[PDB]
Amino acid sequence: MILDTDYITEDGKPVIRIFKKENGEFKIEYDRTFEPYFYALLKDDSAIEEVKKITAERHGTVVTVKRVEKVQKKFLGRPVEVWKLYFTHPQDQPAIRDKIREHPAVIDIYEYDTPFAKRYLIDKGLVPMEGDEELKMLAFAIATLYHEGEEFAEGPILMISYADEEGARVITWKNVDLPYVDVVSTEREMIKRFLRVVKEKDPDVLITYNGDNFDFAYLKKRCEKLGINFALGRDGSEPKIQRMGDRFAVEVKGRIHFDLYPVIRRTINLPTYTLEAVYEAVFGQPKEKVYAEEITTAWETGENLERVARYSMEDAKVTYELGKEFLPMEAQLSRLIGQSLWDVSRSSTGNLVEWFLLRKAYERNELAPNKPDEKELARRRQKYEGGYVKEPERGLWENIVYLDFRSLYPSIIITHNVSPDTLNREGCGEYDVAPQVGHRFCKDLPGFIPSLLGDLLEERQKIKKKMKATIDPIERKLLDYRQRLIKILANSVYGHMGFENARWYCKECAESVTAWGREYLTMTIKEIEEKYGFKVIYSDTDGFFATIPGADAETVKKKAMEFLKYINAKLPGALELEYEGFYKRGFFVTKKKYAVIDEEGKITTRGLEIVRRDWSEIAKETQARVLEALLKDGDVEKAVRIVKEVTEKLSKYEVPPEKLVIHKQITRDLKDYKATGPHVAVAKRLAARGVKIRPGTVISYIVLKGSGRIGDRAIPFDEFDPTKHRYDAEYYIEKQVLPAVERILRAFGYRKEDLR
DNA sequence: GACCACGGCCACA
DNA sequence: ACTGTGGCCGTGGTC
Ligand SMILES: [Mg+2]
Ligand SMILES: [Mg+2]
Ligand SMILES: [Mg+2]
Ligand SMILES: [Mg+2]
Ligand SMILES: [Mg+2]
């Protein structure tokens, strides 16, 4: 199983290292033959001699062009004659590429910025994380001595915890009498001890939670001060720091540092992403938090260090469990993209399609288009039309079915051969024409994008079959991961075609896809109402809810089964309207806000406040209860009882203040805010007391009793003292709870007055 | 100083 | 930095 790749230098020449795990043991393959290269497009091939003599400067050494090969690749499906420029070392390309672009006779250079070791995974057609090879893992967290107004890592590391299959344990340089605590003297002896434990266990994966930004950085600083060789690398190297936009990530050569924080950021949507919050969300059991002030006071008085030892042990223990939950799927995603788990677990879904496409393009000798320059980025701000959204037949409904298209946009791309290399291609013998936008798409040959999407969705269906037949339990959920990941990857290809900074940007393709989706959807909505007598209640991009007025459920079910047969014969190619589900009732508020109820009894909520992070828990709780009271029982008078009870509780300040917290993210530099809402009024006051407020910070505030601007009297919930503060009951009654339940109960003639 | 457009956040498909 | 479509509110600007 390939685990990562990099390269070292030997007498100037680069050497690819493939970090594998084969037949139970770690091993390193070395390749001294792979040469670095990029392509160049010339006016006349004669100029190759002027450019083969281009020169530049790096490391006090002159970078020159090794050799040049003339090759034929495709660019936009067209036969193009390009010049392959080889170099001796990867670091030659930055030093000389910009000087090459500016030569008179070069139209453009391509694929000039692909990391050498990632280039290798592609050019050699190798796949990380392939095989049944099981990986030995190890989580670790640290405790620190924090004082306000101190430099980062001014204080020592107090505890180092680690967990795996064998259990959780804490090293610490003070006596705590707990069976899982290993005591040493000095923190230098705990760090060397941790190195001893990691080196002995030789784990394939080191799982942290924000170890990209705290744990490894703190360990580094301490190791510099105490003169410790912090050689976690399987080659004996120290952790390597890379830039991650305005952040950092840490490599451990020969291993996979799997930081769970970015992974869980994208995979789960939570109000706050503390280790304790994420653990409760994922496993249903709560995790207790002890704070830095608690930890420092415990360490310097020597008292109650055992609860700090328990916190550190749990940090590692729960970090191992989340590692086991989130790693296998991310290892399947690594397999799909053809990039290392370290990279993929730190990449956006938008970044990954480029890597997948890059690999496919190389498979098909297709010259990857360059990333856009800033002038083209401005030509790419033209907008287009998206999905059709119907104003819901606002109110409550009976016996409704949801019909949705199977992968509407991929079906469209495949069926009509939508690709930048098929758009308005001249001299074809068969075309399809997009509605409204009128873009013609050649069909003589399958295009780049439709070929991959077909291979992808074909593979996904193969996977799902072998899965349902698989006789191994792990391989089952592995295959389950692969096909689930293929579905997400398929429907990010449309988003790519419209993305500002996408290599295969094609606005004409992107708007042709949405145009076809709107035609097909509004057509089926027309046919189901006219031919079959339904009424479409609400329709977003690729589906709709509908029923037959004053009709049975069995009548709605069977007749809808009929309409599916009728409409799927009318639908061309891979388009397919399917029967997603039946629901006994459903309330529809506005566009993007509804909630339906199974005949088994499960409620599904969409877009309403119940699903919103930035709404108080008391409002979401109470609205939920009002939904159940209606969808489950039609008890319009139980719903009003709920609201009157809740408002009475708030007015008596009887509601737990924990339910009144509002979570809003910071998205930019506070310098750059033009409008200051309450959460950025809190933030600006926090930074004024020296708190790091970066993009991503989840402000969590409460509104205290008073008058005037909400922001002027909102405080962080970190600082709510029920003996020194009264929350603003009037705000949470009148500006949170009532407005949320009222949008629903207005359909039955209830004003906010009727809800007390 | 009542009325409102709207930065700004997050949801949906 | 995957897309477009959309609801909602605290805030300050407006005649
Ligand atoms: Mg790497
Ligand atoms: Mg930490
Ligand atoms: Mg058509
Ligand atoms: Mg955009
Ligand atoms: Mg829909």
Automatic annotation (TrEMBL):
SMART domains, sorted: POLBc
GO MF term list: DNA binding; DNA-directed DNA polymerase activity; metal ion binding; nucleotide binding
Binding of Mg(2+) 7, residues: D404, F405, D542
Domain of life of the organism encoding this protein: Archaea
Entry's EC annotation: 2.7.7.7
Binding site for Mg(2+) 8: D404, E578, E580
Listed name of the protein: DNA polymerase
